[PDB]
Amino acid sequence: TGQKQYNVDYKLETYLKIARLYLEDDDPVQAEAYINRASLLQNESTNEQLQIHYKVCYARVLDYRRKFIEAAQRYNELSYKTIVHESERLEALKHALHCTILASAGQQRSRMLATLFKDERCQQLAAYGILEKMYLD
Amino acid sequence: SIDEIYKYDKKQQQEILAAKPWTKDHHYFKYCKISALALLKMVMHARSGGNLEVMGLMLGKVDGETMIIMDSFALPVEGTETRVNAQAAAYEYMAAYIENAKQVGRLENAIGWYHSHPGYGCWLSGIDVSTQMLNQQFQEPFVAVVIDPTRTISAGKVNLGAFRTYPKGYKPPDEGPSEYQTIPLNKIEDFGVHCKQYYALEVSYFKSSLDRKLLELLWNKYWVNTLSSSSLLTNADYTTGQVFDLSEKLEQSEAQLGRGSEDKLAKATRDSCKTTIEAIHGLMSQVIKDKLFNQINI
Amino acid sequence: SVMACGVTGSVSVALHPLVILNISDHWIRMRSQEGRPVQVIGALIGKQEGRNIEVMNSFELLSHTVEEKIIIDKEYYYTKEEQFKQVFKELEFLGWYTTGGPPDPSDIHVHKQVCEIIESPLFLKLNPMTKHTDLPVSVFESVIDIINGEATMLFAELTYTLATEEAERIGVDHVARMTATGSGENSTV
Ligand SMILES: [Zn+2]
């Protein structure tokens, strides 16, 4: 709205941080509004880490809006990316686990639960005693 | 080399198609060689539907007097036996299947049509004869196959038949024994009329080298399924039904002795054995198992 | 090496012998067509309930070759997906098959193309001219781990119990054990 014009890496970073903050105070009514305006400028970016921090923050907008099954698809995706540092792929995979478990009993969820026992990386997670016992009924 | 038959000579087919030894002699084709895959899928198609008759299409070739069947598949049609030529519903899935199948390997042409007959032998009904006559009329080299899945089980061996119909005008020669199978009276009439209008084909079963070698390697772990077979609750609703058939056949011959088709106790006696012979054979494999697995002590 | 080797589990698999024979017919026929051994490829179908998986029937798929990479022509799969949903309306898409050695890179590239279609694609591989005195048919699945800072696909091998259907069992007992003039006096027993 301002007179001046700004770049992609500033606007996509600003709406990233705005949406991330309204969630931290528990208010997804506000956080959903600015991440929607962030999606306009994420296709336009050539930044290989800023698009990654959008999908980490878009997975959380579906998490705090209780779309747990679709949130698991975002989180699971990010743990498989090598560009993301190894200690940050552990959190990426574990947030998928929580949102795979707490979702409603979908058939899509049964295939996620299968991917979660198939992946040895999940064995390291603390809710494996739940998952092991969940997937195998 | 056993794989003499899994070969497919296409130019030889179209020379025979033009030559035609079937328009010269009415009963030319007498034998029928059924492949390894063809047998399994046809048996599987019949039982899969089960109680209901469902027909598919067969693919194959000709050789001498033998009408060889190579590969088979299903036709998603309904009203088999109740409609004359029930394959008309899915004229799409005949040519469309062979057009897809020829891209992947199945070069074989239309050789016939097969249907299931659950719990009442292998034969052509009055509805089946009208289908096959007109099949032979236009779409030549076409053979009508039949399988009885429910009895294949209880009898304990492949219950199957392959037939061809005669012309409406010329009538068959004499040489014909034709073996007896229990025909339920509800159907005996329909069979009885149109039964002499056709002739069967001498069935034979073959296999490839790989098929033969695979089945031998397969048998290492398939003996387990033989001794946990139990043909009792599997086909429970054939044997329990055959009783209902048997009861009627006696009911007739009882009154036949009285006041009032020639001695229908001789049939019923053979049916009472037929059906019970199975029931006993069942309890052979059961006691065989009780002997084996239960009686070891700790 | 490009297979898994780890503490597996996951699903439990069954296997109908009709599937083995439909591949066997498909190998011998395509082998015969070209006068050489052929790596034939096709699709798997059957019942899927909960974890457990049964493979009932199987058919063929169209394939091409971009450079050295085996391209499953998907436009053919979707066409046959029509026709197999017609006849066996109950059945589901499960996986795919091929012939040759054990699992290798050329099938991992194909496994990616089946992974676009479904989220849990099984994989059978058969050795036609096998040296094994045992059966050369082993079942596998897609598993992915960290290969030294690299998330990448692997094959976790699984076992297979054989199918039981009484009507089918006779089909096996007939061709694997043929009455080629071996019963004169009925006997029955
Ligand atoms: Zn019929």
Side-chain angles (χ1 to χ4, degrees), chain A, chain B, chain C residues 1-176 178-180 182-184 188-189:
Chain A
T1 52
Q3 189 179 358
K4 200 180 164 217
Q5 203 81 348
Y6 290 80
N7 74 11
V8 179
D9 293 22
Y10 180 62
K11 291 192 288 171
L12 179 54
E13 185 179 331
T14 305
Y15 301 128
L16 214 320
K17 204 163 188 173
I18 288 163
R20 187 165 295 180
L21 281 162
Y22 277 108
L23 296 172
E24 290 276 23
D25 201 57
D26 263 300
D27 207 328
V29 174
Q30 293 289 320
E32 196 205 336
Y34 293 98
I35 197 68
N36 283 10
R37 298 153 79 172
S39 68
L40 300 175
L41 314 168
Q42 186 268 120
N43 302 12
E44 198 168 23
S45 195
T46 92
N47 197 345
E48 217 175 329
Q49 207 168 34
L50 184 52
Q51 289 192 8
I52 287 173
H53 285 296
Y54 168 89
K55 302 293 171 173
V56 171
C57 204
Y58 181 65
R60 268 163 41 86
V61 173
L62 303 170
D63 190 12
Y64 277 84
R65 292 290 308 115
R66 306 179 217 167
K67 296 190 191 79
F68 301 114
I69 216 297
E70 294 192 347
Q73 297 160 21
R74 299 282 168 190
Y75 291 129
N76 190 233
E77 270 281 24
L78 290 154
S79 58
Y80 289 120
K81 252 193 157 59
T82 56
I83 177 163
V84 182
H85 214 250
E86 182 172 342
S87 84
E88 294 174 308
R89 305 189 302 181
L90 172 59
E91 187 72 0
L93 187 64
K94 197 175 190 178
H95 245 121
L97 187 77
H98 282 275
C99 300
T100 303
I101 297 164
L102 293 171
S104 302
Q107 179 158 230
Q108 293 175 33
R109 190 177 159 279
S110 308
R111 305 173 214 177
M112 281 257 56
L113 288 157
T115 312
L116 294 165
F117 181 89
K118 285 166 192 178
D119 203 336
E120 191 184 46
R121 303 187 308 186
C122 300
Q123 291 193 39
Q124 300 183 237
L125 307 178
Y128 182 61
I130 285 73
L131 164 60
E132 183 189 33
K133 293 183 166 67
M134 196 52 50
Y135 168 62
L136 306 170
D137 295 332
Chain B
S1 190
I2 293 169
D3 300 348
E4 211 75 5
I5 198 166
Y6 277 81
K7 309 193 182 196
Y8 179 78
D9 196 304
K10 193 177 173 189
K11 198 191 174 179
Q12 189 187 334
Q13 291 294 277
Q14 303 199 333
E15 295 154 22
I16 297 160
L17 277 162
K20 303 175 186 169
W22 47 79
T23 52
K24 319 293 177 170
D25 179 35
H26 291 113
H27 52 106
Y28 179 72
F29 294 123
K30 299 182 185 73
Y31 314 95
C32 180
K33 277 177 187 176
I34 302 170
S35 81
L37 172 57
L39 180 58
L40 253 293
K41 204 197 277 194
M42 283 190 293
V43 168
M44 273 277 292
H45 188 229
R47 183 69 186 180
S48 51
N51 298 297
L52 322 180
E53 300 104 297
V54 273
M55 66 168 81
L57 195 78
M58 310 192 304
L59 301 173
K61 58 174 195 172
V62 295
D63 202 337
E65 291 187 11
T66 314
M67 287 191 73
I68 304 164
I69 305 163
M70 298 267 286
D71 177 31
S72 65
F73 65 102
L75 291 170
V77 300
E78 188 174 359
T80 300
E81 210 80 3
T82 46
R83 200 216 293 190
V84 182
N85 195 60
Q87 75 199 42
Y91 272 124
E92 297 180 59
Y93 293 91
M94 272 187 269
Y97 189 96
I98 300 166
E99 199 169 338
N100 293 333
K102 280 169 172 168
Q103 288 187 345
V104 288
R106 295 151 172 173
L107 308 178
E108 293 95 25
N109 300 356
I111 207 74
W113 71 281
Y114 70 102
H115 69 269
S116 64
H117 256 207
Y120 56 105
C122 279
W123 46 276
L124 314 185
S125 64
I127 300 96
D128 296 352
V129 170
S130 290
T131 304
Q132 182 57 17
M133 268 189 67
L134 300 171
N135 253 314
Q136 282 171 224
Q137 198 92 50
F138 313 99
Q139 301 156 40
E140 206 21 288
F142 236 79
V143 58
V145 165
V146 193
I147 296 181
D148 192 339
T150 342
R151 273 194 215 181
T152 295
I153 296 158
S154 70
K157 230 150 185 285
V158 173
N159 206 328
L160 181 145
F163 301 82
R164 270 186 68 83
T165 55
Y166 273 113
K168 177 188 166 191
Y170 163 60
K171 300 293 176 188
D174 263 308
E175 279 278 29
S178 205
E179 199 179 52
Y180 174 54
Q181 270 189 99
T182 299
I183 319 302
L185 293 169
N186 37 301
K187 281 287 196 170
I188 200 172
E189 298 261 315
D190 195 5
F191 167 70
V193 177
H194 306 268
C195 58
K196 289 285 179 183
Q197 302 187 0
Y198 56 81
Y199 78 109
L201 286 84
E202 178 167 305
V203 182
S204 42
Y205 306 86
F206 66 88
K207 55 197 180 185
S208 73
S209 62
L210 179 64
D211 286 316
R212 189 169 62 88
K213 286 195 279 188
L214 270 164
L215 286 165
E216 199 170 40
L217 295 169
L218 179 70
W219 200 258
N220 301 329
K221 208 160 199 165
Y222 208 74
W223 57 265
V224 174
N225 308 4
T226 315
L227 300 171
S228 55
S229 55
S230 184
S231 175
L232 270 149
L233 289 177
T234 315
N235 66 282
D237 305 310
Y238 164 73
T239 55
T240 52
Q242 278 276 310
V243 168
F244 234 64
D245 162 50
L246 193 60
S247 175
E248 292 185 345
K249 281 213 175 201
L250 298 170
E251 193 175 0
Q252 293 183 337
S253 57
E254 186 180 320
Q256 189 202 315
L257 288 166
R259 311 301 188 281
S261 52
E262 185 69 35
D263 180 21
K264 281 192 164 169
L265 189 62
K267 295 188 190 185
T269 313
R270 213 71 274 178
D271 294 4
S272 64
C273 294
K274 161 62 176 168
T275 309
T276 313
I277 282 162
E278 295 169 358
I280 301 154
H281 276 120
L283 203 66
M284 284 194 160
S285 73
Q286 304 305 333
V287 175
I288 281 163
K289 295 182 293 170
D290 189 37
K291 295 262 182 182
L292 285 161
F293 305 99
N294 308 8
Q295 297 163 209
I296 304 295
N297 270 308
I298 301 95
Chain C
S1 180
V2 207
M3 73 171 287
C5 296
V7 292
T8 68
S10 180
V11 302
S12 198
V13 183
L15 179 57
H16 266 251
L18 172 69
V19 180
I20 291 166
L21 273 51
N22 204 307
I23 299 159
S24 179
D25 168 56
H26 191 212
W27 188 80
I28 292 289
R29 196 166 49 200
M30 291 308 305
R31 166 188 155 283
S32 179
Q33 266 190 232
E34 299 172 13
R36 68 151 76 80
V38 179
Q39 179 176 330
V40 303
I41 300 168
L44 301 173
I45 50 167
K47 303 183 185 181
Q48 186 162 210
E49 279 182 305
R51 295 194 302 97
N52 302 338
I53 294 165
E54 178 173 43
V55 194
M56 272 196 73
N57 213 331
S58 58
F59 66 100
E60 305 81 35
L61 275 174
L62 187 61
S63 56
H64 285 289
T65 316
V66 170
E67 296 181 315
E68 314 306 330
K69 318 179 188 183
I70 304 162
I71 297 292
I72 295 294
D73 206 324
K74 294 179 182 71
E75 186 58 38
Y76 186 86
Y77 165 67
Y78 296 120
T79 310
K80 269 271 190 158
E81 184 165 18
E82 195 84 336
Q83 290 199 314
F84 100 76
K85 287 285 172 190
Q86 303 308 318
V87 301
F88 276 111
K89 304 155 196 179
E90 301 162 32
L91 274 56
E92 226 97 46
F93 188 62
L94 312 179
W96 67 288
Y97 70 80
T98 189
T99 57
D104 36 35
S106 67
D107 299 343
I108 293 167
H109 175 83
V110 174
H111 203 96
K112 170 63 177 185
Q113 296 174 33
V114 186
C115 282
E116 283 191 338
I117 303 165
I118 44 162
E119 259 72 42
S120 177
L122 290 178
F123 176 51
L124 180 147
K125 199 162 188 190
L126 184 146
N127 200 357
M129 297 281 283
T130 191
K131 292 199 296 183
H132 277 300
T133 45
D134 297 310
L135 192 74
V137 181
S138 298
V139 193
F140 300 82
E141 70 187 25
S142 50
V143 174
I144 168 160
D145 306 316
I146 296 163
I147 302 295
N148 286 339
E150 294 298 324
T152 181
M153 190 196 292
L154 295 167
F155 286 127
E157 192 174 336
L158 310 98
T159 56
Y160 50 101
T161 59
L162 293 184
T164 52
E165 179 44 54
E166 199 65 17
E168 181 187 45
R169 200 201 65 75
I170 297 159
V172 173
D173 217 304
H174 196 98
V175 186
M178 283 165 48
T179 305
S183 196
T188 72
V189 180

